[PDB]
């Protein structure tokens, strides 16, 4: 486009929303917290993998 024309995203394009951004990171560290507490309950490292 011609010299002097810039662009910007506002509205719905500023933000960008949900699954595909970092929501499986949530599922992920949730899972890490889980295997942690399972290594607490079984006092193994394998056994939670069951």
């Amino acid at each position: 486009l011609p010299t002097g024309v810039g662009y910007d995203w506002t509205g719905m394009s500023y933000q960008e929303r949900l699954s595909g951004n970092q929501a499986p990171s949530l599922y992920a560290i949730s899972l890490i917290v889980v295997f942690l507490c399972l290594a607490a309950l079984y006092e193994s490292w394998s056994i939670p993998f069951s």
Binding site: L36, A40, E43
Partner: protein
């Protein structure tokens, strides 16, 4: 609370592991400035009769 922390090894481990995860996040989310905010508040009205 020792002899049971002494008997189940990974329990404490998981506890520390957690404490580090926390303090490690709270580094990323923590804003680095010089010192604390020190001065009283100064509000300031400012006009000009040219």
């Amino acid at each position: 609370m020792p002899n049971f922390f002494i008997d189940r090894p990974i329990f404490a481990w998981v506890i520390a592991i957690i404490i580090m995860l926390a303090g490690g996040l709270a580094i990323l989310k923590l804003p680095v400035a010089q010192y604390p905010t020190i001065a009283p508040p100064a509000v300031t009205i400012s006009a000009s009769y040219p």
